[PDB]
Amino acid sequence: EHAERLPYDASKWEFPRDRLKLGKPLGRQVIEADAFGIDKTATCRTVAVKMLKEGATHSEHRALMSELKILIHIGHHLNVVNLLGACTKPGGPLMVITEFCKFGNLSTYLRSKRNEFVPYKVAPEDLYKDFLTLEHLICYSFQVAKGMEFLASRKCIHRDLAARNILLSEKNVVKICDFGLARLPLKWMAPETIFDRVYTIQSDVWSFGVLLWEIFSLGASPYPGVKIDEEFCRRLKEGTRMRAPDYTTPEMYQTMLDCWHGEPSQRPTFSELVEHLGNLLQANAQQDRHHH
Ligand SMILES: COc1cc(Nc2ncnc(-c3cccnc3Nc3ccccc3)n2)cc(OC)c1OC
Structure with a gap:
């Protein structure tokens, strides 16, 4: 367990916070959003964003980080909702970005x-x-x-x-x-x-x-x-x-x-x-x- 503590390759997954424009919620908390240059499929694309609620508990923070690490571990496949990036560094909330x-x-x-x-x-x-x-x-x-x-x-x-x-x-x-x-x-x-x-x-x-x-x-x-x-x-x-x-x-x-x-x-x-x-x-x- 404790997947949230696994090594994180920022050079590969970290995504600039202002290159993301949050939109309307899809569920809860998953949000629809526009991403700028997250991949080589186009300059702009819609994405899904799971954001850590503000005032969230330490336990809830570990849970979301663990999800990110698990997604990275599992890898890519056309028939699964794939991870595209993440915002983990200081300056804003933890966000996990996936295909939409x-x-x-x-x-x-x-x-x-x-x-x-x-x-x-x-x-x-x-x-x-x-x-x-x-x-x-x-x-x-x-x-x-x-x-x-x-x-x-x-x-x-x-x-x-x-x-x-x-x-x-x-x-x-x-x-x-x-x-x-x-x-x-x-x-x-x-x-x-x-x-x-x-x-x-x-x-x-x-x-x-x-x-x-x-x-x-x-x-x-x-x-x-x-x-x-x-x-x-x-x-x-x-x-x-x-x-x-x-x-x-x-x-x-x-x-x-x-x-x-x-x-x-x-x-x-x-x-x-x-x-x-x-x-x-x-x-x-x-x-x-x-x-x-
Ligand atoms: C028609 O509009 C809808 C669109 C989507 N799309 C979508 N695309 C990508 N990821 C998720 C998604 C939804 C819920 C939970 N997670 C995800 N994806 C995700 C997985 C891991 C990490 C972050 C996000 N959802 C889902 C809807 O409801 C199911 C829905 O109806 C309102």
């Missing part, structure tokens, strides 16, 4: 497309402008799997993998968020975790399965109308699983069931999920041949 995902969380976004989805578009395709398709959904799944494969390879156990924690950027790029931290979460927890309290990469795979259900239900709430009590936990341990979501393919539902294997060691690995989802994305394209 313009479209918010995936669950909310998918729910907004309930009446704007078709498995495959048909010509004239303009009748389905901006609609989601099976390709989009499988692609989102594929991306998160790749992001988790990377996190798992860095020995990072997410613990709260859910659609609400997947953010959408431009060009349908999705990123996993809240992975370097210090309602009804039980609906995403593996049986061993509910009863034994220990999180592992394998319990993250179980959560990934629920996330897939969320994606192919277009943002629906897991276990529709079910009371999440002891009876639920008991039935889950016994083998009860959700039925297929409305927009799933047969292969995707089986993959959901595979991720929900009662035995942790029998669930697929994220690397296996990456290979499989990639294969399904490729096979789905083979179904859309009007323009071949």
Whole structure:
């Protein structure tokens, strides 16, 4: 522990405070902001900033610094919300700067497309402008799997993998968020975790399965109308699983069931999920041949 005390390479991460223009809050305290020359992708770009509340306790200060160090340790990957810089030197508050995902969380976004989805578009395709398709959904799944494969390879156990924690950027790029931290979460927890309290990469795979259900239900709430009590936990341990979501393919539902294997060691690995989802994305394209 005590990650906040790890060596910090200022030459690589320190960012000038006045090269940052704070904007409106995104949550709490995360703030949207404009950065000037933080990377070689453009002169100006929007970013997300986690700022240490003023009058914060020493403990809270250590927590935020620890988060920064953990982000640095983990490293970069296209499918995770990446660290861009930090303001740690005297003269102002501690700030951690990350990439900004313009479209918010995936669950909310998918729910907004309930009446704007078709498995495959048909010509004239303009009748389905901006609609989601099976390709989009499988692609989102594929991306998160790749992001988790990377996190798992860095020995990072997410613990709260859910659609609400997947953010959408431009060009349908999705990123996993809240992975370097210090309602009804039980609906995403593996049986061993509910009863034994220990999180592992394998319990993250179980959560990934629920996330897939969320994606192919277009943002629906897991276990529709079910009371999440002891009876639920008991039935889950016994083998009860959700039925297929409305927009799933047969292969995707089986993959959901595979991720929900009662035995942790029998669930697929994220690397296996990456290979499989990639294969399904490729096979789905083979179904859309009007323009071949
Ligand atoms: C549509 O507008 C929204 C945009 C975002 N984007 C975003 N982009 C980057 N990082 C975070 C982010 C959000 C919450 C917590 N952390 C982060 N990123 C972060 C991680 C580590 C260190 C600092 C920031 N969020 C999130 C929203 O809500 C989820 C949201 O709806 C209001």
